[PDB]
Amino acid sequence: MIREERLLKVLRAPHVSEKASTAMEKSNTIVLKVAKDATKAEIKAAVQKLFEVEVEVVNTLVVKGKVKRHGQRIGRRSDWKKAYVTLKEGQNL
Amino acid sequence: MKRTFQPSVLKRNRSHGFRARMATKNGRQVLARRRAKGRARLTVSK
Amino acid sequence: SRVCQVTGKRPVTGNNRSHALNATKRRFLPNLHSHRFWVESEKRFVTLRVSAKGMRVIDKKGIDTVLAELRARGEKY
Amino acid sequence: AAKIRRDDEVIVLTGKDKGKRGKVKNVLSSGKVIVEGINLVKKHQKPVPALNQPGGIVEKEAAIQVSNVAIFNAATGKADRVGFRFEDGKKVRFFKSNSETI
Amino acid sequence: MKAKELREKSVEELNTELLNLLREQFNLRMQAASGQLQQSHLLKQVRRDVARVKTLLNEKAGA
Amino acid sequence: XXXXXXXXXXXXXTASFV
RNA sequence: UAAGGUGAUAUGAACCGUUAUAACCGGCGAUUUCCGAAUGGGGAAACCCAGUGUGUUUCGACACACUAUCAUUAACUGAAUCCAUAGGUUAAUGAGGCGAACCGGGGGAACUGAAACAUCUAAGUACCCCGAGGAAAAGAAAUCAACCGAGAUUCCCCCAGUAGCGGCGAGCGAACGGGGAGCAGCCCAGAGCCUGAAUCAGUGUGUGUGUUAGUGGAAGCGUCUGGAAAGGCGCGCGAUACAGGGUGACAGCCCCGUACACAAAAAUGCACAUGCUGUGAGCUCGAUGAGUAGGGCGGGACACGUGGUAUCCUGUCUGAAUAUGGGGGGACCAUCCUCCAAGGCUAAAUACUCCUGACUGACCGAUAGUGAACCAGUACCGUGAGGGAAAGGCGAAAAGAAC
RNA sequence: CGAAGGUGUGCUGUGAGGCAUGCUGGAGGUAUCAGAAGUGCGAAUGCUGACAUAAGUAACGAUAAAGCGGGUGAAAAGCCCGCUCGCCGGAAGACCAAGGGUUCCUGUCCAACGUUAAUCGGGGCAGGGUGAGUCGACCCCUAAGGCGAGGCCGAAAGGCGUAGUCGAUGGGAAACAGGUUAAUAUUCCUGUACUUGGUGUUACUGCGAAGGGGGGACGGAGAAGGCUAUGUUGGCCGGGCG
RNA sequence: UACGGUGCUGAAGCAACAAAUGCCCUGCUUCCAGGAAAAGCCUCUAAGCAUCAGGUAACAUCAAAUCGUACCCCAAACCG
Ligand SMILES: Nc1ncnc2c1ncn2[C@@H]1O[C@H](COP(=O)(O)OP(=O)(O)OP(=O)(O)O)[C@@H](O)[C@H]1O
Ligand SMILES: Nc1ncnc2c1ncn2[C@@H]1O[C@H](COP(=O)(O)OP(=O)(O)OP(=O)(O)O)[C@@H](O)[C@H]1O
Ligand SMILES: [Mg+2]
Ligand SMILES: [Mg+2]
Ligand SMILES: [Mg+2]
Ligand SMILES: [Mg+2]
Ligand SMILES: [Mg+2]
Ligand SMILES: [Mg+2]
Ligand SMILES: [Mg+2]
Ligand SMILES: [Mg+2]
Ligand SMILES: [Mg+2]
Ligand SMILES: [Mg+2]
Ligand SMILES: [Mg+2]
Ligand SMILES: [Mg+2]
Ligand SMILES: [Mg+2]
Ligand SMILES: [Mg+2]
Ligand SMILES: [Mg+2]
Ligand SMILES: [Mg+2]
Ligand SMILES: [Mg+2]
Ligand SMILES: [Mg+2]
Ligand SMILES: [Mg+2]
Ligand SMILES: [Mg+2]
Ligand SMILES: [Mg+2]
Ligand SMILES: [Mg+2]
Ligand SMILES: [Mg+2]
Ligand SMILES: [Mg+2]
Ligand SMILES: [Mg+2]
Ligand SMILES: [Mg+2]
Ligand SMILES: [Mg+2]
Ligand SMILES: [Mg+2]
Ligand SMILES: [Mg+2]
Ligand SMILES: [Mg+2]
Ligand SMILES: [Mg+2]
Ligand SMILES: [Mg+2]
Ligand SMILES: [Mg+2]
Ligand SMILES: [Mg+2]
Ligand SMILES: [Mg+2]
Ligand SMILES: [Mg+2]
Ligand SMILES: [Mg+2]
Ligand SMILES: [Mg+2]
Ligand SMILES: [Mg+2]
Ligand SMILES: [Mg+2]
Ligand SMILES: [Mg+2]
Ligand SMILES: [Mg+2]
Ligand SMILES: [Mg+2]
């Protein structure tokens, strides 16, 4: 949580779903895609330092990949971890 | 009517799981045979 | 197991032969007995699992001589 | 180590374009080359709205086997074979006839 | 040339270079996901450079 | 598109003793 | 080694190179999540939970390192119990698993044949277990011969389906001797006089020859048919290269290759030479493997099934001589020959092929050939061990059919 | 300037066969005489694949039951909306565990799948969706039982077992109501709480075990009494004068 | 206002009676077939500290990780 090297690989991408848009408008919560092995703590430190924003709490969930077919071949989407990071009141990104 | 297979993951892993098979040499010989045959799924563990 | 610690005698297998010469597999085991031999140099009793043939060789060879061979064999008396 | 390079001038040895001269454009790893405006084929290109909306009968160059073309001497006016030679420690190509370095 | 210059310097300069190099990679990853990055070849470039600098660091660390 | 076949068979009838 | 290239179905986008850091290929390294001998503890494999110590500080924590068991060795401590010993704690080492067949050893069937079936056969086979090497095992006569001699072991062809063994049934089946492949002999059981002699093992040091990338590599045009010429018909040329493959139909001369001739910064094999570190050569005088050989009993192995049955191994009970002495010569005795057990080591000829390269086939050509020419030990089936498929072909080029 | 194979025709030999030709097909084929065979198929309830037959026949999975208007659509008995009717209601409702593993929600499409059609679907395709100091798992603790240093035993493999270490189906700290999404909520927002550790400050100070005791800690049946969930009625409030 | 919805406002919000297989009740009574364990927790002291450490109490403060969480679940989603 304290190493700048660990933090720079924790955040993978922002989530741009309809739920994420509602989160921007209603509860000032940012939805991110993080490393599958990441813990709520380190994620709070990385966002606080790399975005200069105050974080209230971070809840995480694991999304199970979907099973799809490419032609006649079976395949599976990868599992990923979704983090709901709630920013302190007032601050905006 | 109650059919023969009543699934249970804990029972399934404790009976035929990788660690149950490898506990004894005879089970380890099962793994050797399945490795020689080239099985994609060595044991029943997920 | 049933192995003599001096001579190394171990169970062997053979045939029960009847009057009709029927052969059935059997085992011959050594006449093993646990005995406490008095070793004078250490003023101690050391217990060994020996056969009756092993007991005879201990008298002939001396208690100290056999133990020296045992240490070379690494039998951990 | 390749006898035919990107900018070489060649003459077609076999096919419907026998005797025609052209300039190589692309050398494909499959042992085929694309020559500028030689082996024209009319491809029925389906229209794509995202880009190149108007699809019509399009004339483009098709790949030709390297064995089916030969380098053009441009001095004797005939097809020639390529050899290799070390001149100043660098391997260069020369025409088999009249053995002059390219 | 890049590898040569890396070795020439010292550990401290290299560490500053690694952190700076990684920072554009993190920035590039964000632009890539947001659809704002049109020059996609830098993503592979910085990844190789990160590997190159770390390789020189191990070489210059005695072992 | 992945059809198959299976047969186990069973045995029963009446008597033929007269 | 290079003018192209970002592995495939598989395009596309955004690019990176073009005379040499693009790519690709070889050598040597760097990194190598988690499970798996799994080794910090546990565990429903790819997960859960730590301890110690070093170092970091934003005082929330964080990062490395170590911590399995067993064997051997050495220290330190440490009972009953005075010394001791057991035990205990550390530290260095080795091991642990995996893998096709071949090999040695420890165990070890039955079906079947006998036209049934017990001895016997199948067979010391299948199978289980331990162990090891590139080979293993065996091996330097207590061996054979026959009054002449040979001179370790192993393997091949004979001897020979002979001599024998055998409910003398089924069946099993030598040896002596000969011709070959290959040959190699030594050490301890002890001390001197000489002396480090030969020889062997470590290692460097060169030379030679390979291996791991590679390089160059001769000579054909015209015309005819044809969608296309490599085919037909003419006239040439190369060949230490007319092995093959590809190219729009069948190519010595279009292309890749072939014969050829070459190539190594670095790593490595092999062999010779050579330098160090061990290692002991020679001579004289000694010594000469004891609960052993043999025997009784019960089995096993010898082709040999207890038979008149030698020889070998021993579970059991006994038990010598020891060079002025013992073993063997197929019961046994005498004579005579021959050898010296109860301690060890040893290359080659031999067996096998998971794997690598090249090449070959009166071998197969998709219901064949591996189960699998195709994303096959897959789909599927079964709790599981395990079972286990089907499925190749547009055309030269996708030019894969705009409208 | 048309190979093999395929399909006709003609001729020919005592036969197995042979020769040649028209057509398809598109590239092989191969005399003679010798040689070697996985050398000739109608049968084996043969094997594999394909295709018939019965046959447009049986059947289309509980006799709880359907009907209509409107809409969308190329097309509506089956889909959507609406109004009726009927069935279950100690279930045919609601929430879970086990087990399954995206079947959940939205858009789009009708090849295959649905025993019919299908615009629909638990079908295809593309996106989205599960948020926990107080819920579980995990963690601490043990039952049966498993494994098991050393140890005992056993041809080998191994068997048994001590200290230990695992193993819930049992024992251990703590969260409720309201609101909100197309799909999540004791997990998310609002309001109001609670628990166990770490650190610091202050004050007062006997602490301390792998020990000891208590507690945890426990059956069957039966009998009431006091309560709550919950229901009924009245009152109250709003609406109604059929 | 997009049939949704969204925003605002919002009365009474009591009593009696009946009533569990749910709670007091891990109780009480009775019986014979005589009805887990351990840890957390409370307490007691050994050795080893008793200035310390540690304990108690009050504030302030940090921390509570990781994993499941959709949906079906007497069924068209499980075993047939
Ligand atoms: N005590 C022994 N032990 C073993 N072998 C021996 C013994 N004596 C002699 N031999 C051998 O027997 C042979 C000589 O036989 P013999 O005993 O009659 O003569 P010797 O004089 O005793 O022997 P040597 O000359 O060696 O001393 C030699 O090969 C010798 O090696
Ligand atoms: N039984 C075989 N199995 C496989 N390949 C074989 C066999 N026999 C021969 N070959 C092939 O034959 C090749 C050798 O044949 P061969 O030596 O007789 O040719 P050559 O022309 O006579 O040469 P030269 O005259 O120099 O001896 C082998 O390299 C091998 O590829
Ligand atoms: Mg969670
Ligand atoms: Mg070349
Ligand atoms: Mg581990
Ligand atoms: Mg373990
Ligand atoms: Mg557990
Ligand atoms: Mg260790
Ligand atoms: Mg093994
Ligand atoms: Mg018989
Ligand atoms: Mg080896
Ligand atoms: Mg003898
Ligand atoms: Mg004799
Ligand atoms: Mg002797
Ligand atoms: Mg075919
Ligand atoms: Mg096949
Ligand atoms: Mg046949
Ligand atoms: Mg037929
Ligand atoms: Mg017939
Ligand atoms: Mg029939
Ligand atoms: Mg038939
Ligand atoms: Mg078929
Ligand atoms: Mg009909
Ligand atoms: Mg009918
Ligand atoms: Mg009818
Ligand atoms: Mg009918
Ligand atoms: Mg029905
Ligand atoms: Mg209608
Ligand atoms: Mg229709
Ligand atoms: Mg009803
Ligand atoms: Mg009711
Ligand atoms: Mg009822
Ligand atoms: Mg579940
Ligand atoms: Mg699906
Ligand atoms: Mg749905
Ligand atoms: Mg249908
Ligand atoms: Mg669907
Ligand atoms: Mg043990
Ligand atoms: Mg439970
Ligand atoms: Mg919250
Ligand atoms: Mg009430
Ligand atoms: Mg009841
Ligand atoms: Mg739910
Ligand atoms: Mg729901
Ligand atoms: Mg049903």
Tab-separated table of C-alpha atoms (C1' of nucleotides) in Angstrom, chain F residues 3-5, chain G residues 367 389-391, chain H residues 46-51:
chain	number	residue	atom	x	y	z
F	3	UNK	CA	-26.806	-36.506	-32.078
F	4	UNK	CA	-25.937	-39.987	-30.689
F	5	UNK	CA	-27.354	-43.491	-29.927
G	367	U	C1'	-14.053	-47.136	-43.243
G	389	A	C1'	-15.585	-40.687	-31.557
G	390	A	C1'	-16.985	-38.395	-36.112
G	391	A	C1'	-14.715	-34.902	-39.171
H	46	G	C1'	-21.058	-59.250	-40.058
H	47	C	C1'	-18.823	-53.606	-39.063
H	48	U	C1'	-19.416	-48.180	-40.487
H	49	G	C1'	-22.060	-44.601	-43.357
H	50	A	C1'	-26.185	-43.466	-46.527
H	51	C	C1'	-31.145	-44.368	-47.833
